Amino acid sequence: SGFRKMAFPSGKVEGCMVQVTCGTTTLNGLWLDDVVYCPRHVICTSEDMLNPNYEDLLIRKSNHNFLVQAGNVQLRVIGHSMQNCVLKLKVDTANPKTPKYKFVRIQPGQTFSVLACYNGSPSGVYQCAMRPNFTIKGSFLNGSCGSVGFNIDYDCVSFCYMHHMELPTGVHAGTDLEGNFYGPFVDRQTAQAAGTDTTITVNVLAWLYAAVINGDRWFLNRFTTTLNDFNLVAMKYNYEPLTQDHVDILGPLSAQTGIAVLDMCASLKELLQNGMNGRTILGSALLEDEFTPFDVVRQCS
Amino acid sequence: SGFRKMAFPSGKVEGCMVQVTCGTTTLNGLWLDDVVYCPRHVICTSEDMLNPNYEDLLIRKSNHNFLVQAGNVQLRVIGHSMQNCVLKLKVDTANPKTPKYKFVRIQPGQTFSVLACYNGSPSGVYQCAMRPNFTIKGSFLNGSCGSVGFNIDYDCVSFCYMHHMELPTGVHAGTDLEGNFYGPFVDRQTAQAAGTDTTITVNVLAWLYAAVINGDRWFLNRFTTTLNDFNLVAMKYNYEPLTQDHVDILGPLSAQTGIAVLDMCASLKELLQNGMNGRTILGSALLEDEFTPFDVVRQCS
Ligand code: NA
Ligand code: NA
């Protein structure tokens, strides 16, 4: 027992990180087979960050202007191309450490591990969720461009995120591995609205089930509710509406604990209306929404 | 910016995990050079967990009774020995993936990454702190025996923890890599007192400095205090007394933010006396004590 925000073991990804330099800009890339993936930011300079003309910038660059190093091993670049907001650098050697892998576009509310990296070198790993508004609340310093997010399922790494930017509000924005931003963002250094976020209701419910499984049970009550009545409360407190698809996804946890989903919703309702009363759940004094139902079942069995 | 509970990249440790089976018991071991390290629990059965006679149990075992597998690679055991609560299995092959490493006994209040593992296979990574009372609040299921905790400093892995047991209270106890328990614990399935814990004051202070560095600044106030006056409050709220050694360790963060340590202590005092008033700091509604000053400076630069 115990309940922690747990990342995937990062070894399979650490073997794929490289440094890519173009001119004076250095950032991180991902070396899979004989292709290196990195943010197209690598071809900009300060003085054109307000609205870079990436097509013009890239035309000035040849293969030999991209310097790629994997540890101290230098790679030879034999092709380049831009797709959306990513660059694909063809190199002459396949990465011997390439894991079984896939590129996935995750949904808002889904979680993934981030391997924060600087100069091609891994520095730490943590879990986060793709917010409803398609931002992430990461931890990323100057040089973190190109860091990647992923899930692992039996030795297959599903890459889902490549880090680009910090918005002026402190939250983070990035792309899938095909270079398409999650959310409305563009790769320029400008104030950009993220728009209203919400709390991920089905994850909060998953986490309450995890709490019960660990014997934090104080918030269970003698009430039930309906989907409609709970959704009234969800809207009041800026939670996502609960659908029968969410109820279905919560069925294993329901069955395991013997607590019907709508009974757990009645507990959540009471927590939203009354607060926590200066108590804690699984070591938190807030309602936590960055564990999916799949995460809870992983860590709870 | 942003502030997350970040683990070390686990790749260097994942290459060292193996499965060790003795009779019907399977748990995790750590393969470094030509030695496999694992909890001596591996030689017990149910029916002798209340007070195992490990010396007698081990006498019944020969080299060939320890089955060690690294992936599907089986290792040949050519010696065994017990030291404290660990077994050292000499094998005939040095681990080709052995990192540069050291064994360290960490101090209470220090943090480390845990690689949770089952059947020799890594499942996830998370950060925690060694509590003042020498427990850890981990996440560990049946089969987690032998999982390890570590820090990494420039490609040198400092192993500091090997997981043994869950106490009946849900918190976790384990040893250094020489098999000595942290705390008063013994490897038997018995209720055992951990004794009073405290909050790690110097870490809470570090975390407030991290909050300021990220622009969560609402708790700063117009007051100061003395070490003596703050220690009166620390004792009231079951915080560790603050020493000048702790003040000295906080000096870089002090210098970076321009906030004197005793002025930050006055903020903390006010937080302890008044609570958080339904607000948050770095995404938490509690005072967080699992980031050391060294952790904050790592993640904040
Ligand atoms: Na959650
Ligand atoms: Na802390």
Swiss-Prot record, chains A, B:
What is known to happen upon mutating Q189A? Does not affect ability to cleave and inactivate human TRMT1
Q: Where is the active site?
A: H41 (for 3cl-pro activity), C145 (nucleophile)
Q: Which residues form the Peptidase C30 domain?
A: 1-301
Describe the effect of P132H: In strain: Omicron/BA.1, Omicron/BA.2, Omicron/BA.2.12.1, Omicron/BA.2.75, Omicron/BA.4, Omicron/BA.5, Omicron/BQ.1.1, Omicron/XBB.1.5, Omicron/EG.5.1
Q: For side Cytoplasmic, which residue ranges?
A: 1-301
Q: Quote the annotated effect of L205V.
A: In strain: Zeta/P.2
Q: Using the record, list the residue span of the signal peptide; answer none if the entry has no such feature.
A: none
Report the subcellular localization: Host cytoplasm; Host Golgi apparatus; Host nucleus
Activity regulation details: Inhibited by pyridone-containing alpha-ketoamides compounds 13a and 13b. In turn, alpha-ketoamide 13b (tert-butyl (1-((S)-1-(((S)-4-(benzylamino)-3,4-dioxo-1-((S)-2-oxopyrrolidin-3-yl)butan-2-yl)amino)-3-cyclopropyl-1-oxopropan-2-yl)-2-oxo-1,2-dihydropyridin-3-yl)carbamate) inhibits SARS-CoV-2 replication in human lung cells. Inhibited ex vivo by michael acceptor inhibitor N3. Inhibited ex vivo by compound 11a and 11b.
Q: Which reaction does it catalyse?
A: TSAVLQ-|-SGFRK-NH2 and SGVTFQ-|-GKFKK the two peptides corresponding to the two self-cleavage sites of the SARS 3C-like proteinase are the two most reactive peptide substrates. The enzyme exhibits a strong preference for substrates containing Gln at P1 position and Leu at P2 position
Record location of the Glycyl lysine isopeptide (Lys-Gly) (interchain with G-Cter in ubiquitin) cross-link: K5, K90
**Effect noted on mutating K90R:** In strain: Beta/B.1.351
Coiled-coil stretches noted in the UniProt entry, renumbered to this chain: none
The protein's job, in short, is: Cleaves the C-terminus of replicase polyprotein at 11 sites. Recognizes substrates containing the core sequence [ILMVF]-Q-|-[SGACN]. Cleaves and inactivates human TRMT1, preventing tRNA guanine(26)-dimethylation of tRNAs. May cleave human NLRP1 in lung epithelial cells, thereby activating the NLRP1 inflammasome pathway. May cleave human GSDMD, triggering alternative GSDME-mediated epithelial cell death upon activation of the NLRP1 inflammasome, which may enhance the release interleukins 1B, 6, 16 and 18. Also able to bind an ADP-ribose-1''-phosphate (ADRP).
| Subunit architecture | 3CL-PRO exists as monomer and homodimer. Only the homodimer shows catalytic activity. Interacts with host FBXO22; this interaction promotes the proteasomal degradation of nsp5.
What is this protein called in UniProt? 3C-like proteinase nsp5
- Gene source species: Severe acute respiratory syndrome coronavirus 2
Encoding gene per record: rep
Span within the full-length protein is 3264 to 3564 of 7096
